[PDB]
Design a binder for this molecule. Structure first.
Ligand SMILES: C[C@H](O)CNCc1ccc2c(c1)OCO2
Lengths: 412, 412
């Protein structure tokens, strides 16, 4: 019968820091991690900026000889996974290695690597393709390499649900523990889609902010002057753990994961419904899953991508789910500061949601200078808001109409 | 407790046929789907053959315009999925659409699209990248497009666990129904990696059979002259359904899904341990899940890729799990005929496991002319074997040491 699940460890690479504490300080101070991109020439692109991971040293984690074989998304995933495990204090042994699994996902995976090998193929021939092209690019290799390095023999898999990946990864890993398939799961996601095909591809679809001359003000969720999402890189990993297993070993518990919802919009390949019907279904699923009155919700970490249709759909979903309580809770998009980490988005945002519970503060939506028509909720414009948070909700919505909601609460 | 899960619809594209009955007819006849790859310059490549889908007409399923938006792997997953839903007789209504979800996966995803858009990028610049590049290439768009075309609002996700994808997709879909999160799921996998990058990428790891003189003899699982796997394309989809839901509408039930096992080798990035310790834990996990003794297993559809180390590890794993019953069961590799459909391998081989139960026949391992050292099990060499089959296992063991096992049982 269904077991309870707590968070005992967290790790992160974001545009704001090379770990959780440093990233979280940036969040609470309203700092942007968005800057013109330096790792390639974007003069022929309509978008020339994003949230890069700055000064990442893979040799804090791996040998240069292994690192070279792996796409950045995998390096980022392992760094965050390693951080989360260290932060948990958990020791892998013969007694428990079979009860510890990993579900680290990505939206796009090794696009940089696949592009580079495509270039080698087209310009030089097939004999210049890396022998590591497949194990070093495909999405399940975060879960793979983590299990090899730590000796994790539990359930080993990866989700790819586009911008919903990190939320789904975390939610399903909690279901694994809930149902007895595992006692511990390392779950989240990683993304590094800032190559030509990534920036070009979102560019072709006219989905990205083109504010090349003011990159820190580009991501402006619910602002009337928003013009698309900002593309960001990084990783989030959490250690999820059966409550009694955590209690038995005296683990520090950050929070309890009480709720998980999924739904499909069945509306459009890329556009959300204007009324947020799919998001409303998903949140209601998650709150029912948690046994909650919707009035218990204090804080929502919105998807909040800074697209015209996405942002407004979310307001509608929250108003429809929470009614008059929609006016009492605080909702913010940390994408105002981090940008959109795509498949890692749900992962870093689940960490920020937990930290909102630990520190009792709503992170700000920076750049919200003129809230758009109907965007009249407490969106924590400009500045972090200290406040009572017992229950925090993290939303994600992706291409394919795929929706995810996580529900966290304080644990005593 | 836990709801029972049955199979009420199946769909398929394979190198043997454009649907299930044509593919199954090839399987039982021991026909090969392997041939030199056409309309593609493989001159500089060490492998020139594989299992292509022959004569696929996407306009039976989609308009020309919607198909132009989608990678072949997505077209193949939609084909299989529409066939499976149609095969099931299911009527989607307002009253049930929130209880019907999708989990269709891929191991490698949109390489053909990535290649063609790379061509554009390098030759002409980013502004020639297709607007539909991203949503038309990402792995969750089979689940996404299927849910939109049919109005499915239940759990909407996609696994990517390399060569284990289709096994995990079906297993986790069965969990969703068992634990009351859905009444119906469409689950499986699709793959189209018979492009330059797939053939070049795997060719660079020297993972592929190079037997160009005799493509139909290349895939020879457990044969002492095997020299690696054969790369193949296609899709499988099953309609999974809660038993009482299936009985109430009078569904035709092919078989019951009674068990799902997962495990990680925690061994190596591409190589299994020699003793198959991980495949052994996974099969034991699947049998415990089913509440079955190893002695009750009649038929195993092996992973059986035709890699030197893979085939021998699976022999060790079965001998370890099944002790004195290991010779009594029949075990065959349908990859001897289909090749390795990678992420779709577990989907089509689940379908072949279900039809082995319906038709009481173990499919052959063709090309098994000279079993290797220790390959002395009943591997159904050369020809189909009619026999009693109450319980059938389908195994998938993929890169990152990720293992999957499904247990099916006759329903009457
Ligand atoms: C780090 C580097 O970008 C990887 N190789 C790409 C690359 C390969 C071959 C080429 C080329 C470019 O221009 C002409 O022939």
């Amino acid at each position: 019968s269904r077991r309870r699940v707590v968070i005992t460890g967290m790790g992160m690479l974001s545009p704001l820091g090379l770990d959780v504490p440093s990233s979280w300080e940036g969040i609470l101070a309203g700092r942007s991690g968005i800057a013109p991109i330096e790792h390639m020439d974007l003069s022929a692109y309509s978008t020339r900026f994003g949230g890069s991971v700055k000064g990442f040293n893979v040799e804090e984690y791996l040998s240069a000889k292994e690192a070279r074989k792996l796409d950045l998304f995998i390096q980022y995933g392992l760094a965050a996974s390693f951080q989360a495990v260290r932060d948990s204090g958990l020791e892998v042994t013969d007694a428990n290695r079979e009860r510890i699994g990993v579900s680290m996902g990505s939206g796009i995976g090794g696009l940089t690597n696949i592009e580079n090998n495509c270039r080698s193929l087209f310009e030089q021939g097939p004999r210049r393709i890396s022998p590591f092209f497949v194990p070093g690019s495909i999405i399940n290799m975060v879960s793979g390499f983590l299990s090899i390095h730590l000796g994790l023999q539990g359930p080993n898999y990866a989700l790819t649900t586009a911008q919903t990946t990190g939320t789904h990864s975390i939610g399903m890993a909690a279901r694994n523990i809930a149902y007895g398939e595992a006692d511990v799961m390392v779950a989240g996601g990683s993304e590094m889609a800032a190559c030509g095909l990534g920036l070009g591809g979102f560019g072709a679809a006219r989905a990205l902010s083109t504010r090349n001359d003011e990159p820190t003000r580009a991501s402006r969720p619910w602002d009337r002057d928003r013009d698309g999402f900002v593309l960001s890189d990084g990783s989030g990993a959490l250690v999820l753990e059966e409550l009694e297993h955590a209690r038995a070993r005296g683990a520090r518990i950050y929070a309890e994961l009480v709720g998980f919802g999924m739904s499909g919009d069945a509306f459009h390949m890329t556009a959300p419904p204007e009324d947020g019907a799919g998001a409303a279904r998903c949140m209601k699923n998650a709150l029912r899953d948690a046994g909650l009155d919707p009035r218990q919700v204090d804080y929502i970490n919105a998807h909040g991508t800074s697209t015209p249709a996405g942002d407004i759909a979310e307001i509608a979903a929250v108003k429809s789910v929470f009614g008059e309580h929609a006016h009492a809770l605080s909702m913010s998009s940390t994408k105002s500061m981090t940008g959109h980490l795509l498949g890692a988005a749900g992962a870093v945002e689940a960490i920020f949601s937990v930290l909102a519970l630990r520190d009792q503060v709503a992170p700000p939506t920076i750049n919200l200078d003129n809230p758009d028509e109907g965007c009249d909720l407490d969106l924590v414009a400009h500045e972090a808001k200290p406040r009572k948070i017992d229950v925090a909700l993290s939303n994600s919505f992706g291409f394919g109409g795929t929706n995810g909601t996580l529900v966290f609460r304080r644990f005593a």
